Design a protein around this ligand. Structure first.
Ligand SMILES: CC(C)(C)NC(=O)c1cncn1C1CCN(c2ccc(-c3nnc(C(F)(F)F)o3)cn2)CC1
Length: 273
């Protein structure tokens, strides 16, 4: 029942109740004493950010805590924190006990077309909000396991904003767990909004197939070689609905200048109310 952690100002309490873990992260129940609203207390594994790097992140956190949109996970605050020999970055966000799209697909095996349409439209509204900030905010790591639902029949919210800074393409990655990948141009660290369109395409592909794209590869290097040569995931040919397949195809183009804009996707016949 007891508090097992606190922010310096006492606004946020940590409870010894584990919500889940995964990808350098453990998430606990917590409390905003200022509103009595329960929150998620996310503890991040530590790197060694140069204090060039650490200043960029505190700047980014300051930018991101000021944002509010119905399809973006609300972010409240971040700071460094110790227990024993471990230091971490704590991130406080709104609590989403219903979990992610990844978990949804596991539980319900398939996503029905009406749900896919509604939730993809919400993901697009979220991305459009980000891309129209001044200056634009690019997510850079959108995937089904960081898109959260408010309920099994609720709305979706984009999670993990701002965390992609810490994990560039130049950065060496152990071959363990599910292999990651990104839009082709991202590997060279020069890029823009369309990387989120490519990622959206891959999200929609996963929602339509209940498979992780490129499941046929065993490591990240294999996927790079295919993505940078325009070789699609095998799952693409398993998409049953032509209109869904066409949308995915128009998002996951190797050449960024050929990809759909967020505007054209929102205006697409598939997404009309
Ligand atoms: C089952 C499991 C998957 C373990 N569940 C949850 O992880 C979970 C449960 N309830 C909530 N969660 C999630 C907790 C983690 N999430 C975050 C974290 C940080 C940020 C963020 N926004 N701006 C920044 C900035 F500026 F870079 F610091 O960071 C956005 N989302 C997404 C919700």
């Amino acid at each position: 029942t007891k508090a097992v952690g606190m922010s310096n100002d006492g606004r946020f309490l940590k409870f010894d109740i584990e919500i889940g873990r995964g990808s350098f992260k453990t998430v606990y129940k917590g409390l905003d004493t200022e509103t009595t609203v329960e929150v998620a207390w996310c503890e991040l594994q530590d790197r060694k950010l140069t204090k060039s790097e650490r200043q960029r992140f505190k700047e980014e956190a300051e930018m991101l805590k000021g944002l509010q949109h119905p399809n973006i996970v609300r972010f409240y605050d971040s700071w460094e924190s110790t227990v024993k020999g471990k230091k971490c970055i704590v991130l406080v966000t709104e609590l989403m006990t219903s979990g992610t799209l990844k978990t949804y697909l596991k539980r319900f095996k398939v996503m029905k077309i009406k749900v896919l349409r509604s939730w993809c439209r919400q993901i697009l509204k979220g991305l459009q909000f980000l891309h129209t900030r001044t200056p634009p905010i690019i997510h850079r790591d959108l995937k089904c396991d960081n898109i959260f639902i408010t309920g099994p029949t609720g709305s979706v919210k984009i999670g993990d904003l701002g965390l992609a800074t810490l994990k560039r393409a130049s950065f060496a990655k152990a071959v363990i767990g599910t292999p990651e990948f990104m839009a082709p141009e991202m590997y060279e660290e020069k890029y823009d909004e369309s990387v989120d369109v490519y990622a959206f395409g891959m999200c929609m592909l996963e929602m339509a197939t209940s498979e992780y794209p490129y499941s046929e590869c065993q490591n990240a290097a294999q996927i790079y070689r295919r993505v940078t040569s325009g070789v699609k995931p095998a799952s693409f040919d398993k998409v049953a609905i032509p209109e869904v397949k066409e949308i995915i195809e128009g998002c996951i183009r190797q050449n960024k200048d050929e990809r759909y804009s967020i505007k054209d996707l929102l205006n697409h016949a598939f997404f009309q109310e």
